[PDB]
Design a protein around this ligand. Structure first.
Ligand SMILES: Nc1ncnc2c1ncn2[C@@H]1O[C@H](COP(=O)(O)OP(=O)(O)NP(=O)(O)O)[C@@H](O)[C@H]1O
Ligand SMILES: [Mg+2]
Length: 555
């Protein structure tokens, strides 16, 4: 633990950390330690330097040691802080003075904080009935939004809320069993916003009154005003204030739309998630069950896309249909195309455009999930109001879908913003994975310009030079895609030619940091753009680095 450290704050936010740093003066080398906001038992170090706050993720190693950016192992957070007081390996400056928790501030750790993870998990399971991987993938992407949502549930279902019990009943419930200091319950004093907070202190029960303001706010006599019992308990679990002590363990109760959340959409789960829905016996879909609309959604190098409708046993599924060119009809391409289509149909993840099946009719047809808001680059160019935090959320879902493709030994080959489609403004899906290989794309597609875009601008050096496509080269493309996202749909390597791009990269030169792009996101782009394939991270490391930054900045 880090609880004994007087400059350790527990699970506070990044902005609360920064507010403490300003409270302490903002002198260079002023620092504090806190908990990583990821349920991974890690830490975060917040440092003042040049009127700015610098945040670093401290991860727990398998052996129980600690390290920053896969670097030097340290025995404990205290040992890590001791080390960085004399040498800064990658840190902005050395650590000179700790900012101790102000008088009256305890670490934001404890039972209330501990319940959050199980509460979010339970909330997903009962709101969306998700299980296994669909459930895990929902929590990973949506943890910040889910944390906000559990804070709005009715206090009546909370373990520390005992309802209409009497003062004598509450006295007896708080006293029973081990007399842990801070053991508490909240009970209703009446139906009109009147409550009692019962707290255990040195074997005695303290009965505090919580009253509702004319303003609808809840507080104890002369104490801070809160909107909910959730906020009240959260604050009192680390700031004693009026109370003789912080709240600790709840007493056991007697007994024992273009803004929708990804899981609020039909496409989040596979159509065949319903056991009543019977999955086709192969990659082949029945042309008789498919109806296409006349108007095109768009087109590209490999074909034209239309909106369609696929008749299933218990519903009409809206689909997007890519009709391959005449070139795809060549008997020489058939086996490779069917082989890749089988592998594409195996992929099941919320953050990919699932390939439902194929139709060999008037032309070859790829039946896919609909992502109606269209491509990421065009959307951002048309909606510059989209916040940096919303962009982090979308690129993080892309990193999740890419980790899944990598785990599945699937190489995308054309990972770019044009191939990231939006279901909602908070829900991105990777499209056209492995299409260029399935269709045996020509040298003129890779080297030259097609539809106003230069595909080589997304290729790792070993792809252009040695034609070696791998999950590591997809990592490179992800860095270019991150740059596109942060540039609100701008084209990469402005006005350059493939020859000019290749030679620039050989020199170790890279694209610049987009306006308003965080330093840590530009550092991630630079890591993806590692020339050497062996030193370049895989998607597991990219997703975790992105996840950690996302959880630290969003709410
Ligand atoms: N599953 C889908 N759902 C909704 N719209 C889609 C889907 N797939 C493709 N589209 C639309 O069709 C447009 C063109 O798609 P596409 O044929 O893949 O070209 P591209 O990816 O922009 N360039 P290219 O590398 O040549 O394929 C996209 O920009 C979307 O508007
Ligand atoms: Mg595409």
């Amino acid at each position: 633990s880090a609880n004994h450290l007087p400059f350790f704050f527990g699970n506070i936010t990044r902005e609360e950390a920064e507010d403490y740093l300003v409270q302490g003066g903002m002198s260079d080398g002023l620092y504090l330690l806190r908990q990583s906001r990821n349920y991974l038992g890690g830490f975060a170090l917040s440092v003042a330097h040049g009127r700015k706050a610098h945040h670093y993720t401290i991860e727990r190693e398998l052996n129980g040691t600690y390290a920053i950016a896969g670097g030097r192992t340290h025995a404990s957070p205290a040992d890590l802080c001791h080390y960085h007081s004399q040498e800064s390996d990658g840190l902005v400056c050395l650590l000179k003075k700790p900012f101790n928790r102000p008088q009256g501030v305890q670490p934001k750790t404890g039972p209330f904080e501990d319940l959050k993870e199980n509460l979010i998990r339970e909330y997903v399971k009962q709101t969306w009935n998700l299980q296994g991987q669909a459930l895990e993938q929902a929590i990973i992407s949506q943890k910040p939004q889910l944390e906000k949502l559990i804070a709005t549930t009715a206090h009546e279902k909370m373990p520390w809320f005992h309802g209409k019990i009497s003062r004598e009943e509450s006295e007896q419930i708080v006293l029973i069993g081990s007399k842990t200091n801070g053991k508490f319950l909240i009970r209703a004093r009446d139906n009109n916003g009147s409550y009692a907070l019962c707290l255990l202190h040195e074997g005695k029960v303290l009965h505090y009154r919580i009253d509702k303001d004319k303003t609808g706010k809840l507080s104890i006599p002369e104490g801070k005003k809160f909107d909910t019992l959730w906020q009240l308990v959260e604050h009192y679990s680390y700031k004693a204030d009026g109370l003789l002590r912080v709240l600790t363990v709840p007493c056991q109760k007697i007994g024992t739309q273009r803004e929708a959340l990804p899981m609020d959409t039909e496409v989040y789960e596979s159509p065949y998630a319903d056991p009543e829905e019977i999955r086709p016996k192969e990659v082949y879909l029945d042309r008789k069950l498919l109806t296409l609309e006349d108007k095109e959604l768009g087109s590209g190098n490999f074909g034209t896309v239309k909106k369609g409708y696929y008749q299933m046993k218990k519903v009409v599924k809206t689909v997007a249909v890519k009709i391959l060119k005449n070139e795809a009809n060549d008997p020489a391409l058939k086996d490779e195309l069917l082989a890749e289509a089988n592998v594409m149909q195996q992929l099941d993840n919320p953050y990919i455009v699932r390939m439902i099946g194929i139709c060999e009719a008037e032309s070859w047809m790829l039946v896919m999930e609909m992502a109606e808001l269209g491509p990421l680059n065009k959307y951002l160019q048309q909606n510059r109001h989209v916040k940096d935090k919303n962009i982090i959320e979308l690129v993080h879902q892309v990193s999740m879908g890419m980790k899944y493709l990598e785990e599945s030994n699937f190489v995308h080959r054309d990972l770019a913003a044009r191939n990231v489609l939006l279901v909602t403004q908070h829900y991105a899906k990777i499209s056209d994975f492995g299409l260029s290989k399935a269709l045996r794309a020509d040298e003129n597609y890779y080297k030259a310009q097609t539809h106003g875009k230069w595909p080589v601008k997304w290729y790792a050096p070993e792809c252009i030079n040695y034609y070696k496509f791998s999950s590591k080269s997809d990592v490179w493309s992800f860095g270019v895609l991150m740059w596109e996202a942060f540039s609100y749909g701008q084209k990469p390597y402005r006005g350059m030619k493939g020859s000019e791009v290749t030679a620039m990269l050989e020199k170790g030169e890279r694209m610049g940091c987009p306006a308003g792009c965080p330093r840590e996101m530009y550092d991630l782009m630079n890591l993806c753009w590692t020339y050497d394939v062996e030193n370049r991270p895989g998607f597991a490391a990219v997703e975790l680095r992105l996840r950690n930054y996302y959880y630290d900045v969003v709410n």
